[PDB]
Amino acid sequence: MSFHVTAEDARIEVRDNRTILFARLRREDGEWNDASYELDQIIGNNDGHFQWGGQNFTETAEDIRFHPKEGAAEQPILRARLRDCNGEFHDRDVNLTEIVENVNGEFQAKF
């Protein structure tokens, strides 16, 4: 059970009302380099529904927590409370690791 060796420092943060994800990534050289990339251009909130597309949903969301590995499943889910168009806020979750992948300490959006 090893999705990709192991994920360390793989957490997101709120920077300038924008989502920012940083983590140690390994390049083909076999070296581990800590990279940081804003998820604000990858994830998004649509009227309270979690829809990753490219929005600074981080400002319209709370409880900004990312877990790229869930127990033995190593399920990468992004948790965030979004506020629905009615004004109701609820926590949502989406597979962020499946959105962007590691390309030698860099990120690439598959969606």
Side-chain angles (χ1 to χ4, degrees), residues 50 57 61-64 78-82 90-92:
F50 213 148
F57 103 124
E62 204 56 81
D63 201 67
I64 308 297
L78 200 201
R79 264 288 179 81
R81 176 241 68 193
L82 329 174
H90 285 274
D91 64 281
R92 312 292 184 202

Side-chain angles (χ1 to χ4, degrees), residues 51-63:
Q51 210 311 89
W52 59 102
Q55 310 271 267
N56 48 215
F57 103 124
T58 265
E59 55 100 74
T60 181
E62 204 56 81
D63 201 67

Side-chain angles (χ1 to χ4, degrees), residues 33 60 70 81 96 101 108 111:
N33 178 266
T60 181
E70 182 179 279
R81 176 241 68 193
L96 192 156
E101 56 177 85
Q108 174 59 32
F111 284 92

Side-chain angles (χ1 to χ4, degrees), residues 4-106:
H4 204 270
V5 183
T6 185
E8 174 170 53
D9 278 280
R11 294 176 180 130
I12 54 180
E13 277 204 49
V14 179
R15 232 279 194 113
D16 189 49
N17 285 272
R18 284 181 280 159
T19 334
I20 167 54
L21 193 164
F22 41 88
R24 149 257 279 224
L25 313 174
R26 196 167 61 138
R27 347 99 57 107
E28 57 179 72
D29 198 73
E31 175 201 271
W32 276 297
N33 178 266
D34 291 71
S36 48
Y37 47 97
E38 300 72 71
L39 259 291
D40 89 286
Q41 52 204 324
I42 335 288
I43 95 298
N45 165 34
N46 187 88
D47 295 282
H49 310 136
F50 213 148
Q51 210 311 89
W52 59 102
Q55 310 271 267
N56 48 215
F57 103 124
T58 265
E59 55 100 74
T60 181
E62 204 56 81
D63 201 67
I64 308 297
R65 214 62 179 179
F66 174 63
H67 209 216
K69 86 288 303 207
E70 182 179 279
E74 308 171 88
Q75 214 183 211
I77 316 294
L78 200 201
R79 264 288 179 81
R81 176 241 68 193
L82 329 174
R83 199 186 305 146
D84 292 91
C85 51
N86 184 270
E88 238 293 60
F89 46 88
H90 285 274
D91 64 281
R92 312 292 184 202
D93 30 80
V94 292
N95 48 331
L96 192 156
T97 268
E98 283 185 80
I99 320 176
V100 291
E101 56 177 85
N102 165 37
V103 53
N104 278 217
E106 303 182 66

